[PDB]
């Protein structure tokens, strides 16, 4: 019994490395060169990997996991018993794969055209418009156009996608696809735990929302901002209003402190996409963590091709399951926002390298939120005025202090409600609570309820605004990013204490701390081999998710915001 199970996992591991490596190659080749040919190859490799999953998953299910003694083997076999989409009958699997390909392609090639003019792609063009334009009608054209062309075009696929991903989930023992996604956390109390974390961030978010709302009132006019209502969703500097720091110029707490134009500084100093990833690589090795291999620099796609290729620009980090080949695919722009994204992606890469010697079934983060958080942790230190000054991107007070926390909060605090609601919506689609009759109406009920946002143009039949957000057509879970924003502050607090930092948490910069790197390395090397509380305990000395670190980080800003909003008589929220 035990020996057959040991031999099975050994055979599964050596055969999976080969099949997954070939699939990743074809998937990469399509993502970096969308053509009829690369798609057909990709759909073909999808059947090869499905055949492999079906063979070994079927055998995995013949083992009584209850009777297995070794806990590691037990854990691998139980995981291999989930065939995912390979549980579907051949017809449904082919349909599902084609639906996923059509949805992701549709999103990644959509364009928005000026009337009788040029057509803009999401990256860099529409992203830049949302970030820099300060004109209501210009932002409205981009915001509505992107949903008309990306969102509406996904709607025809989504009901069948839901049917098929749910059918696969049920064939693997779950009640629907959202049940299966939540199980990735191995936490029966996940929904309650996440809800309590969200509620703990309400004071900060409501106060930030009211303050930003007041500033938008000042710039966009009293006829267009209701000081007791939700904020129009196109005015926050980002296509999904998920992060707000691109409107920092409109909301500066102390404008007497002049802001240095960081984008012009990077450009003026010759920064390139390569330089940005090199700086991130240097931060990782400064902690004693691993450098990316030479292969990474030869094979990655660090900027948008200029040779006619159509590509998937949305940033992602790729493990090719051979322990040597790791790559980033990002249409990088030279600015601070994408430097932070670059660090985010390099954290994925770091995780891949740290757990590369585990069995492939355990080459995942402790939970998906851990995988999303690593790069963000370092980026917190990178974003400090001290570190940015050392990169010659800033010029060397309480005013500057509150200014910096506001910049951070526009990204870290504003993202909390957005990242919470995406899968609140999808979980209820998957469990049948939301039908295609009210996809979009229920999306905006959550946009209002959690983010306090409203659409600038009333939605109509045919709209499918969730389809205008990458992770929806690409079928990538989102609660991981909510978890990441909570725990990345817990990790920051812990590493800063390990590094000997005293004083306000937001002044910590862990650059070159070997003590901090070692905490992270010991956790990352566990991969998915243990329940995630153990990785949490290795980093922080305790096992729970907690918002206390994030609240401690932003405490000075919470006090400043309350005083400011009180002074102006704001009514928090949106009744
Ligand atoms: C339950 O099973 C797991 C997994 O076993 C592994 O997979 C099976 C399918 C089968 O192939 C097994 O043969 C195979 O080991 C066990 O977990 C493994 O435990 C061993 C314990 O030694 C670990 O071995 C380590 O491997 C490292 C990389 O090669 C190596 O560096 C380590 O050396 C360290 O210690 C020596 C001591 O002399 C020191 O000299 C070194 O400098 C270094 O510190 C060590 O040899 C495996 O990595 C583990 N693999 C996994 C996946 O966890 C587990 O022990 C078992 N449980 C029970 C109760 O039997
Ligand atoms: O864009 C978003 O919405 C979120 C939030 C953003 C984060 C970055 C730093 C600053 C704060 C926000 C990062 N991100 C991403 O999707 C980037 P990924 O690599 O996780 C996207 C991964 C998609 C799945 C995948 C995996 C491997 C290969 C191909 C596809
Ligand atoms: C893109 O794919 C086509 C067809 O597979 C191929 O001929 C072409 O060389 C590829 N381009 C690049 C830059 O790899
Ligand atoms: Cl939207
Ligand atoms: Cl997740
Ligand atoms: Zn990520």
Residue numbers in the entry: 40 to 435, 439 to 617
Text from the published report:
Human angiotensin I‐converting enzyme (ACE) has two isoforms, somatic ACE (sACE) and testis ACE (tACE). The functions of sACE are widespread, with its involvement in blood pressure regulation most extensively studied. sACE is composed of an N‐domain (nACE) and a C‐domain (cACE), both catalytically active but have significant structural differences, resulting in different substrate specificities.
Here, we report kinetic data and high‐resolution crystal structures of both nACE (1.75 Å) and cACE (1.85 Å) in complex with fosinoprilat, a clinically used inhibitor. Particularly, altered hydrophobic interactions were observed to be a contributing factor. These experimental data contribute to improved understanding of the structural features that dictate ACE inhibitor domain selectivity, allowing further progress towards designing novel 2nd‐generation domain‐specific potent ACE inhibitors suitable for clinical administration, with a variety of potential future therapeutic benefits.
